[PDB]
Assembly symmetry: C2
Homo-oligomer: 196 residues x 2
């Protein structure tokens, strides 16, 4: 006679739900891989487009997610740049979304999209700083690698491809990507765009 | 009190079914993912065309599948395949998909008898004493992810012949078939000489 079966039902519930969450993450990856890979197929040769209109697009899509976070986005005027507008909005997309996703629940999170002539063909470097949780400054090189997550899927579910994608789009443009982080303080990612 | 377990009896059968159904879906989905990635690596592995023995390719493809061939109690007439200027890996891939498809779609009433010949552009053929298909569906036959069969009685991924066509077309060839439902079908592909 089984007291055991009653315990099996507890364990079954765990596993069936494990397959269900483990299979949902697999669906997310399949989608993120299909959206981002089709961008390369739709690639157009670069022309000069206003980066401010592109940014205003990204603030349109995120208009639900921004209010959800009661976050304030201070948007400076972004110049023209010679780039692929569809692909560069995704770079703004993924970056503003990460600054929203990793908002810290104790302070109203504020995001800023700056523009400044960098130095390292003069390239304008666009930067997005946010007051978020940040990550450990040991991870600056690792962060841009795919599927290289810093924490388990318990606290944040993601695919690990978002920001590694940004790097390769910015690299098709002959730019670089980089980040400064202050754990607990906030993190700022930036990417450069070449001129000519 | 028995009603505690009178309940268990009726459900445990279903659970075994359902979980086993989910198990097949996980095999099928993994097969598809793998076959697509093998395909993406084949495009990467493209090497410029050279002269390869087409009979060597046949014997390799006949090597991997000889486990599946003994399973099938089928007879292979392995004719002499000449040289042709092509990619060895990709043409090995094309022989597999056709010979494997010709093994998979065999008739359970007849020992399927298979013929791999070549007849002059050089055209290579695989004739099979297997199932036929109906000429109303030839567009489906070559369409990717459109199989003519449900997954229960015949397993597969649906990309096999769409794969072959991109290979044979990268070689400047054709894909084509004559079919006789119930008797058998013979698929063929051509290669340029120059
Ligand atoms: N603003 C940020 N603050 C803190 N960590 C960040 C920030 N942006 C990115 N990260 C780190 O980047 C790691 C992976 O980034 P990435 O954006 O590529 O993936 P993701 O957010 O998990 O998922 P997805 O691909 O769906 O966007 C995250 O685990 C997080 O640690
Ligand atoms: N020798 C054959 N005899 C009859 N029908 C065939 C034969 N070879 C292929 N077909 C038909 O072609 C359809 C698609 O063939 P194809 O080989 O491309 O895919 P598949 O065998 O279903 O999958 P995969 O090769 O990805 O495992 C098959 O469903 C089958 O109906
Ligand atoms: Mg992201
Ligand atoms: Mg096949």
């Amino acid at each position: 006679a089984d007291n055991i079966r009653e315990m099996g039902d507890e364990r079954l519930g765990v596993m069936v739900s494990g397959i269900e969450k483990s299979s949902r993450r697999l669906r997310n990856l399949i989608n993120d891989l299909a959206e981002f890979s089709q961008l390369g197929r739709r690639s157009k040769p670069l022309s000069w487009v206003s980066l401010e209109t592109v940014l205003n697009e990204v603030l349109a899509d995120l208009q639900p997610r921004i209010t959800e976070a009661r976050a304030e986005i201070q948007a400076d005027r972004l110049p023209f740049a010679r780039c692929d507008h569809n692909q560069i909005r995704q770079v703004l997309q993924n970056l503003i979304a990460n600054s929203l996703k990793y908002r810290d629940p104790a302070r109203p999170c504020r995001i800023r999209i700056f523009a400044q002539p960098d130095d390292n063909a003069p390239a304008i470097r666009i930067c997005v700083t946010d007051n978020g949780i940040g990550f450990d400054k040991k991870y600056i090189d690792q962060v841009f690698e795919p599927f290289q997550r810093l924490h388990g899927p318990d606290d944040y579910e993601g695919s690990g491809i978002g920001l590694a994608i940004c790097r390769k789009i910015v690299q098709r443009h002959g730019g670089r990507v980089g980040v400064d982080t202050v754990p607990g303080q906030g993190s700022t990612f930036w990417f450069t765009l070449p001129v000519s």
